[PDB]
């Protein structure tokens, strides 16, 4: 993230969202949540036809 | 995008010899 040290392997910016839903992510935490579920959203609309084919 | 299209980068396309061009 153009807000973070270079050559850095922290958790506080490799995706560990310490804050909770009650509390409220920061824009960092918020962003990475996003990337994660997308592939999630890709798993459901895109690759849902993988086993629909298997079945026919 | 449209403005910069119309204004300039539209004229650029004039290459019995064609010159400066006007649109209403």
């Amino acid at each position: 993230l153009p807000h973070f040290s270079k050559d850095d392997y922290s958790p506080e910016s490799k995706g560990f969202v310490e804050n909770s839903y009650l509390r409220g992510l920061t824009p960092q935490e918020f962003f990475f949540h996003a990337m994660g579920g997308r592939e999630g959203l890709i798993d459901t609309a895109v690759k849902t036809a993988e086993p629909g084919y298997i079945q026919r | 995008s449209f403005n910069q299209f119309v204004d300039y980068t539209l004229q650029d396309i004039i290459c019995i010899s064609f010159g400066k061009i006007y649109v209403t």
Binding site: - | S1, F2, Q4, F5, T9, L10, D12, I13, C15
Partner: protein, 219 residues
């Protein structure tokens, strides 16, 4: 700034790790086989097989890099001068046109620049090798800054240019003002009106002029 130019440039390091066949060739606009990086350097003008190695290497101390530029030199040792080079691209001079013209043209395709066409070609075979020797992460084809996106302007641009297109070769028929006026209009109309971004009437990136949503302001 005047065309579309679909002629793209390939340059590949043959031979994988443990093969000593690691010849570097290139495939170029309008030429079937792949041409040894060396041959193409000569038809450019850079002739001594070693003269060229300073175009590739920006510090003649990358011994491991140079050791791979070895086969290619012998691969294209068989041709030594400029003439010899582009006859292998086949009166047959035609090769000088093809280099000058449809090749690395985001530079100028005036002949006289034969030294930034090369000092580039090297710069390519350079960056290729840093990745072969894991001093580079191969680029990120999913990297956004490297993606451009045309908006309405450019999109009319392609259409208007490719439209005025066979306007001027229809006026080349008004000899053998009373030229055609409809085609620029009914053209522009068509695409902005089909979403099949025109291209006469053969379809083509279909679904690009979409009618606006009106169920709420936000939408």
């Amino acid at each position: 700034k005047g065309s579309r130019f679909i002629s793209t440039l390939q340059v590949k390091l043959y031979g994988r790790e443990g093969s000593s066949a690691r010849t570097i060739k290139a495939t170029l606009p309008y030429i079937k086989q792949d041409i040894p990086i060396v041959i193409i350097f000569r038809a450019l003008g850079i002739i001594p097989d070693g003269e060229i190695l300073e175009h590739i290497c920006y510090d003649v101390n990358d011994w491991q890099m140079l050791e791979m530029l070895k086969p290619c030199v012998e691969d294209g040792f068989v041709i030594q001068d400029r003439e010899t080079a582009l006859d292998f691209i086949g009166r047959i001079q035609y090769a000088k046109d093809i280099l000058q013209k449809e090749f690395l043209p985001h530079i100028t395709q005036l002949e006289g620049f034969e030294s930034r066409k090369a000092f580039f070609l090297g710069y390519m075979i350079n960056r290729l090798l840093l990745c072969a020797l894991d001093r580079k992460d191969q680029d990120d084809r999913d990297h956004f800054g490297k993606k451009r996106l045309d908006l309405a302007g450019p999109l009319l641009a392609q259409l208007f240019k490719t439209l005025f297109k066979k306007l001027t070769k229809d006026i080349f028929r008004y000899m053998q003002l009373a030229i055609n006026a409809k085609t620029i209009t009914s053209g522009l109309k068509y695409a902005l009106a089909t979403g099949n971004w025109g291209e006469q009437k053969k379809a083509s990136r279909a679904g690009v002029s979409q009618v606006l949503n009106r169920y709420t302001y936000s939408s």
